[PDB]
From Swiss-Prot:
PANTHER family: CYSTEINE DIOXYGENASE (PTHR12918), CYSTEINE DIOXYGENASE TYPE 1 (PTHR12918:SF1). The gene is Cdo1. InterPro entries: CDO_1, RmlC-like_jellyroll, RmlC_Cupin_sf. GO terms for biological process: cysteine metabolic process; L-cysteine catabolic process; L-cysteine metabolic process; lactation; response to amino acid; response to azide; response to cAMP; response to ethanol. This is Cysteine dioxygenase type 1. The thioether cross-link between Cys-89 and Tyr-153 plays a structural role through stabilizing the Fe(2+) ion, and prevents the production of highly damaging free hydroxyl radicals by holding the oxygen radical via hydroxyl hydrogen. One of its GO terms (molecular function) is cysteine dioxygenase activity. Pathway: Organosulfur biosynthesis; taurine biosynthesis; hypotaurine from L-cysteine: step 1/2. Its EC number is 1.13.11.20. Pfam families: CDO_I.
Amino acid sequence: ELLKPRTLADLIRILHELFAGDEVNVEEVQAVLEAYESNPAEWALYAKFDQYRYTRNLVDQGNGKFNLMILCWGEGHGSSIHDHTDSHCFLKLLQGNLKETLFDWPDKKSNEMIKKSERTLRENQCAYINDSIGLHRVENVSHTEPAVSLHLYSPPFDTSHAFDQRTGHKNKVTMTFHSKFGIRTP
Ligand SMILES: [Fe+2]
C-alpha cells in the first residue's frame, strides 16, 4: 500500500518498508520517490556543495539492502560516463535540472561511444537506470542554477567504472562520500 510521503523522513520510513524484502519493485519505488514533494528545508543539512565538482552526501544507510544519498551539482558540474555495478539506481531531482545522456555498453574494439539518447530530468521527477538499460552521464548544464538530486542504490555499491568516450575503455573508480548524515567526512 503506497502512500504519499509527507516529508523526507516519511519517505525514508516508506523506503525501509519497500526494501524489507529480498527483491525490488522498481515501479513502486520510483512512484514513491516521485510522489515526495521536494522541501528544501528538510534536506538543507545534506546539501553540501564543492566549488569544483559534484558531491555525494549520505542520508540514510538503509537496512542492509540500499543506500540513500543526496548529490549536489554546481553550475556546469557533470559525471563521467559510468555504470552502476549491478545495482538499481534511482535518481530524483530535488532542485534544478539535470541532463541525462544514455550510452550503450561498448564492444571490445576501440570506438567512439555515441549517445543513444538524452533527456532533461526536471524538479521532482524520478528516473531509473541499471546496467541492463545501459550506461549514462549526468550533468548540470545550467550556467546559473545549482542542482540537487536524491539517489537510491540497491544493493549499495562503492565502486564503479568510468568510460572513455573516445575509446569505450573503462577504469574502476572508488566512490567516496563528501558527508554522512550531515557531517563532513574529509
Ligand atoms: Fe549514475
